[PDB]
Amino acid sequence: AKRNIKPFDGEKYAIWKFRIRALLAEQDVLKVVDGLMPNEVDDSWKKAERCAKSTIIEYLSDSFLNFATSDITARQILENLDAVYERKSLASQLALRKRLLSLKLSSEMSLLSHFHIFDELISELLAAGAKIEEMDKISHLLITLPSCYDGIITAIETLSEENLTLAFVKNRLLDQEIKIKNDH
Amino acid sequence: AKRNIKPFDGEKYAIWKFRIRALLAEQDVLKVVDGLMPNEVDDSWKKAERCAKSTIIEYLSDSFLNFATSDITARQILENLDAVYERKSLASQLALRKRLLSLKLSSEMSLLSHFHIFDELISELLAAGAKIEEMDKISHLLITLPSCYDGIITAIETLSEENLTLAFVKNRLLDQEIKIKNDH
Amino acid sequence: AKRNIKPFDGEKYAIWKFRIRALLAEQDVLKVVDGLMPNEVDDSWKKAERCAKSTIIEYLSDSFLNFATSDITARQILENLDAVYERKSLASQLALRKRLLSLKLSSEMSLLSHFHIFDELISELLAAGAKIEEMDKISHLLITLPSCYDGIITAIETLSEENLTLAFVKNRLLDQEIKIKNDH
Amino acid sequence: AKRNIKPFDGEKYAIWKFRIRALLAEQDVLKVVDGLMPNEVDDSWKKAERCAKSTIIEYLSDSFLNFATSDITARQILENLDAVYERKSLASQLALRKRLLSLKLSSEMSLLSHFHIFDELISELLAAGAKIEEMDKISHLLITLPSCYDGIITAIETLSEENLTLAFVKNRLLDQEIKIKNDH
Amino acid sequence: AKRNIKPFDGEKYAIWKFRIRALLAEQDVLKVVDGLMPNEVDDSWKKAERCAKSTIIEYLSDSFLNFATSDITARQILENLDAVYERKSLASQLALRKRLLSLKLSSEMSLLSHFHIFDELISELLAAGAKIEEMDKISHLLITLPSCYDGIITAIETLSEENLTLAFVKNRLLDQEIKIKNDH
């Protein structure tokens, strides 16, 4: 019912496990993975085990189905997936942040492609575990721009103080890149 | 079950919150976000909290999952998302309307691309909160056209008075741009 | 559960309303839109109202969500959408049929592109409300062809009399356009 | 719930009807289409009729919604669709098989495009009602190849006798077309 | 409800059967395929048979619907599909591994395309039944690289010992291919 989980393919295991656990908790099945094993198994417990195993099988890619082929419970599958991918880092936060700080808008590139690159970098940083607020995102975006946008920078800083987000800043930046391109 | 909600990525928070609230109300779960906290928690209340948290987790992008990683209720998640994005403007309505009023059909561009641009502008204006009626949409579309369409403008104004919408006007405009292109 | 309804964007309102009404009737909820308002509201009636409003919200585009933002029932939303789009025509049937009758296969164009154009025209005509039988579709397709296909026309007319549909006719036409292209 | 049915657009009516009947039988609703009309209608029968009509409406294209606009039961809709498309042939099996037997791999074309063409032809033949076994598919694929693959043909014939399918044969053929392209 | 199963088209039958069996077990229906035939049939057993047959029909391609057209139970359908595809090999593991070991990064190709090719090869190997650990994947990826990456190889080997996976290794490799391309 929750088709918003990307199948696990060895990348971003923390997000996949979080979404899988949320989905299992939605179906009142997470007690199999988390709760203690009951002394006597009931029909409800067997149904919950089947549902958890089926969900994990559904949200595993064809390459990773070998983790569920053996007659093991969903708890064992998650334990193995943890032992292989639990504490392992997804990327280098310092490298990504160095790339982000070195980002600069080029004359040939338009603001749409630059915004896409900035969004990809920010999304990768946030997926890696870094915590970036909206103000920090805006500051990075503004420092990754040439000096032709100083007018809109001043206007945003002085006027839109209680109304600033990434979307509004990007919209204003595109609005004035239209004028900047016209004035060349 | 409601897969028509775009995951939240920091853009158009009002629409996302409205759709999420509608979906939660559909599942008889919105009482968690809206209703007062009961003195004693029951199994039904815990199930509702789990369902609301799972829904919000499902309809949040991978970048924004940090708002739900902490052991907080769905109400707290929505409160934080509001504190970051509730009253913030999505775009500049005056800038969008200035761009729309300055729109003009060029000789190289066909009516399909012009209609797509007009539709994108109108959709952005409506998402920003502006209220545009069908007559206003038609008036903008007609004033964004050259003088070669005056015949169809007069025919639509005089004949199709109780039958005018954007779709019919666009269809007639394409029908006569065929003839205009033939007569060149 | 019925994800086969295109969200309403101001085009083809009759089809959208028909599909929405069918979906509401499937969920035993159409009594809210159609049935009379009960003297005393019950929990079942409130649940039905919530479900209908949530369904209509789900199957409305982001541009048209303003019809549901106000605290109004699903019946009121449908009444407003009717008052704006109920009896309004979708396109010009005479113009579409004139374009269809004037369709002719060109030497440069292959039969696949011609079939796609013919299918698009027929689909638009049927969506506009016109009633076209299979024999009429076949007749239009055959009269929109050059004289190189007279052999297959005669073979289809004489042999396949109780076995003729658009798909079979198109398949035979492609089969012999292979030979016609070979014989040039 | 069964979103694997392509909406009916006048092509492949047998497959669409088979899938629709299977879906209706899954929901315990096929008794409306198949079973006799009860003397007295009940709430369950009306619910089943609504569900069947809604399912058929959902899995009908916008062009074919005119078959359900009138206040008719799902049984009547299926009866009309049968009267228009039940016994009519989908394509010419002899023509498709003549095209398949005449298929030959060209020097310019790679094995991927040839395999795609062969798969499309086989799929069309199977949809038309023809019965082709795996051995026949393999024989057609092998006879549609040049003499440069005789080594792999002999190896497959002699060694892989209890292990031959279309996928394995295609994989071996690509494996040795790598070598054949290298040896040129 | 489980839309993550690719319809069966004669390729990768083991994965399709595993996913179908998991889905059937989720719905408490696998007892039809696995359990013994009861002496007396009940309404529950007939409902389970209908559900299993409908699921198998849904997750079968249009080419393979002939396995279910006849009035046979889901158990018979699976038995026939096994008799045609159960023990048959999907590809040549030795050929795939020879291709993987011979993989080498070329100057023209970027690391993204090379990573895509490596991922495709590894996925095909894992689908064929081979068991490859994360360390083996990393070793193959590293031996499929030129000598310009020896610095990052040494850094990963010495520093990231308890933190190594394919994703992190690929990210570091791209990070330093940026520098390598800059230094040319």
Residue numbers in the entry:
A (entry chain A), B (entry chain E), C (entry chain D), D (entry chain C), E (entry chain B): 3 to 186
Text from the published report:
Here, we show that the Ty1 retrotransposon Copia forms virus-like capsids in vivo and transfers between cells. Copia is enriched at the Drosophila neuromuscular junction (NMJ) and transported across synapses, and disrupting its expression promotes both synapse development and structural synaptic plasticity. Because Copia behaves in a viral-like manner, we used cryogenic-electron microscopy (cryo-EM) to determine the high-resolution structure of the Copia capsid and found that it is distinct from the related dArc1 capsid, with a larger internal capacity and the presence of pores similar to those used by retroviruses to carry out their reverse transcriptase activity. The capsid layer is composed of the Copiagag protein’s CA region, which contains 2 alpha-helical domains.
To enhance the resolution of the capsid region, we used local reconstruction methods to determine the structures of individual subregions of capsid known as capsomers, which are sub-assemblies that are found at the vertices or faces of the icosahedron. Local reconstruction of the pentameric capsomers found at the vertices provided a map to an overall resolution of ~3.3-Å. The high-quality maps of the locally refined capsomers allowed us to build an atomic model of the Copiagag protein with high confidence and good stereochemistry. The NTDs form central spokes at the center of each capsomer sub-assembly, while the CTD is arranged in the capsomer periphery. In place of the spikes, the Copia capsid contains positively charged pores at the center of each hexameric or pentameric sub-assembly, similar to HIV. The positively charged pores of HIV function as gates for dNTP entry into the capsid for fueling reverse transcriptase activity. We hypothesize that the pores in the Copia capsid play a similar role. Despite the less extensive interfaces between capsid subunits in Copia, we observed an interesting interaction between adjacent CTDs that is not found in other retroelement-derived capsids. We suspect this CTD-CTD interaction plays a key role in stabilizing Copia capsids by locking down the periphery of each capsomer sub-assembly.
